[PDB]
């Protein structure tokens, strides 16, 4: 019934969130990655079948490779919201939790909608970063699409090397929007550069670069 | 400052077609305005043909200054650029 | 046989790294579960 | 919209503000009048046909180079360093086949515009050096391997020693190097084309010169074109 | 699902949008002041079999043929009405075996109110399907795939082509290959997949338009065009609204428009 498809969509969103966390540098165990649907229903759903989003929250730490490559990578806290509509109360509570439990970045997945007050409170949570995603747009992982090539964020040294090699200013590079779906998937901040290796029918392979806004 | 040292020149070592056309035109104009010729002309009279003969023997006394997008430049002699 | 031996060595090293990372991950799993229990 | 776009002396395509539109013109840095349709010989066919065409085994006597095409046919069986060279060539060809079949062209299309017509160069060499008749060739296998390998690192699109420059240069010539390796294979050179030493050196020099002549010229107004 | 026709038809039925107005054939308003009985003689037997507020009655006759064609159940429509209307409307429905398929309703001066309720019901009752996808067709695609021997051999597979676009919802439907769904509108591609996919889709559309009549244009020209059209991070139209909102010189911009 509709409960079964709700559970399936929630499981797909959870898998996409785990894949996103793994692609940004954090470590997620392979058993957790291939955690099947039946195990999800066993671990989350109760006797009547309703799911508890509060049981899906987890923590992550960067791999040594990612930590060496990116030095601004802290601890990640992902939390799903039971409340369909997220008010200023819930956003403030989440901000307080992040501030007290010293996390570098916190991802907050909501179900239906977020109030404008909460959005206006998002930028004032510095130095911690809060990012908001909707449940519906996380069902399918867009980075697995055939039309989406692989994006790789560059380190500060690599960005400096690129700018020196091409003798460019930052404003002279191709741009990518902050609200771009792939930019939001990678958690791009303003001033960061991604390397995009792409298929080419004239040379086989072609590496392009874009700078976030 | 803007000049680039001769050891680290990274532009192509071949004479492009635009550079060849401009160099031939400038040399032909100079020859037609009574400039000394650096090759032995047998019976040639046309300034463009004399300029082409000078180019084939690498005797054109001109320098090409190639501009980079940032403002720097590289200086290449006409005698050190390969011409087809 | 030398290439096979090198491949086995690399697989064993990767397995050891994976085991160490799993050991590190289990502590985070336990802490997250405890904090979620506290939230309830 | 496209009037102020020009190829610059560093190879990039830029507008009047200096903003980069393409890091290499046409992703290969070539002129549009210098390419022709050519077939890549590693893409089509079956695995049996590919193995039969490209694999050279110096141990099995009925799956080796023919004895009437090479003057050194006697002291060739049993070598291990040469067999290692041939295995390295075959592994490179298999990597090229995997790359083209899985990433670049997934539907199997193999007739694409590329520079330097190799068939024309090969038949020109055959006509010039009179490569007819059953005469054995004096072209050793390591000479073939090292000549092709060195040729695949002199196709300069970008000049410089920076690591990014080398990565871009290797990226820009991937498809053309696949074409060259698919054509100038050891078994193919020895049996189908029957080149000798002078013909081989002429082919290598001609490929290098013609590739140099096929690059786009800085100052081109490619936007208007 | 791609090599089976029945599963493909199941997916097609689950994707296509179907409203109440599609299966409805006629709607009527009747006066009946008895909640437990009725005046109409044709339906009296069925309603008394069922039984064993306002006097206004609302019954609508639905076409049997198109209701069976869409593969829908009367109970499903009843649950949809019950969900959208809670207990504000009492609903009854004739069984499958009825000669004419009917479903009544009763409210719990209100003739105009019932008329507005009937119009609203006909307008926006969604039975199933993705909103915006008006029609769905089945298409066969000839695709060349390598064999187990390495040889390339043709093949035939089933695929759906729709009218109307909703990429995000259709991509999440089970049974759909979510990593290959394509739209002919690249604004939606930009909103869902990003700017690199937008570049690829823009090249694909331009190539389709150019190559339909048999013409051929070299790749680098269209590549340069779509790279100019996607270099700023968003879609830049070839118009005054796109070209003249740049940072170029005033003299260069004034000479266009």
From TrEMBL, chain A:
<feature type="domain" description="RNA polymerase subunit H/Rpb5 C-terminal">
    <location>
        <begin position="140"/>
        <end position="212"/>
    </location>
</feature>
<dbReference type="InterPro" id="IPR035913">
    <property type="entry name" value="RPB5-like_sf"/>
</dbReference>
<dbReference type="GO" id="GO:0006384">
    <property type="term" value="P:transcription initiation at RNA polymerase III promoter"/>
</dbReference>
<feature type="domain" description="RNA polymerase Rpb5 N-terminal">
    <location>
        <begin position="6"/>
        <end position="97"/>
    </location>
</feature>
<dbReference type="GO" id="GO:0006367">
    <property type="term" value="P:transcription initiation at RNA polymerase II promoter"/>
</dbReference>
<dbReference type="GO" id="GO:0005666">
    <property type="term" value="C:RNA polymerase III complex"/>
</dbReference>
<dbReference type="Pfam" id="PF03871">
    <property type="entry name" value="RNA_pol_Rpb5_N"/>
</dbReference>
<dbReference type="GO" id="GO:0006363">
    <property type="term" value="P:termination of RNA polymerase I transcription"/>
</dbReference>
<dbReference type="GO" id="GO:0003899">
    <property type="term" value="F:DNA-directed RNA polymerase activity"/>
</dbReference>
<dbReference type="GO" id="GO:0006362">
    <property type="term" value="P:transcription elongation by RNA polymerase I"/>
</dbReference>
<dbReference type="GO" id="GO:0006368">
    <property type="term" value="P:transcription elongation by RNA polymerase II"/>
</dbReference>
<protein>
    <recommendedName>
        <fullName>DNA-directed RNA polymerases I, II, and III subunit RPABC1</fullName>
    </recommendedName>
</protein>
Automatic annotation (TrEMBL), chain B:
<comment type="similarity">
    <text>Belongs to the archaeal Rpo6/eukaryotic RPB6 RNA polymerase subunit family.</text>
</comment>
<keyword id="KW-0240">DNA-directed RNA polymerase</keyword>
<keyword id="KW-0804">Transcription</keyword>
<protein>
    <recommendedName>
        <fullName>DNA-directed RNA polymerases I, II, and III subunit RPABC2</fullName>
    </recommendedName>
</protein>
<keyword id="KW-0539">Nucleus</keyword>
<dbReference type="GO" id="GO:0005666">
    <property type="term" value="C:RNA polymerase III complex"/>
</dbReference>
<dbReference type="GO" id="GO:0005736">
    <property type="term" value="C:RNA polymerase I complex"/>
</dbReference>
<dbReference type="GO" id="GO:0006366">
    <property type="term" value="P:transcription by RNA polymerase II"/>
</dbReference>
<dbReference type="GO" id="GO:0003677">
    <property type="term" value="F:DNA binding"/>
</dbReference>
<dbReference type="GO" id="GO:0006362">
    <property type="term" value="P:transcription elongation by RNA polymerase I"/>
</dbReference>
<dbReference type="GO" id="GO:0005665">
    <property type="term" value="C:RNA polymerase II, core complex"/>
</dbReference>
<dbReference type="GO" id="GO:0003899">
    <property type="term" value="F:DNA-directed RNA polymerase activity"/>
</dbReference>
UniProtKB/TrEMBL annotation, chain C:
<protein>
    <submittedName>
        <fullName>Component of the Paf1p complex</fullName>
    </submittedName>
</protein>
<feature type="coiled-coil region">
    <location>
        <begin position="1"/>
        <end position="31"/>
    </location>
</feature>
UniProtKB/TrEMBL annotation, chain D:
<protein>
    <recommendedName>
        <fullName>DNA-directed RNA polymerase subunit</fullName>
    </recommendedName>
</protein>
<comment type="similarity">
    <text>Belongs to the RNA polymerase beta' chain family.</text>
</comment>
<comment type="function">
    <text>DNA-dependent RNA polymerase catalyzes the transcription of DNA into RNA using the four ribonucleoside triphosphates as substrates.</text>
</comment>
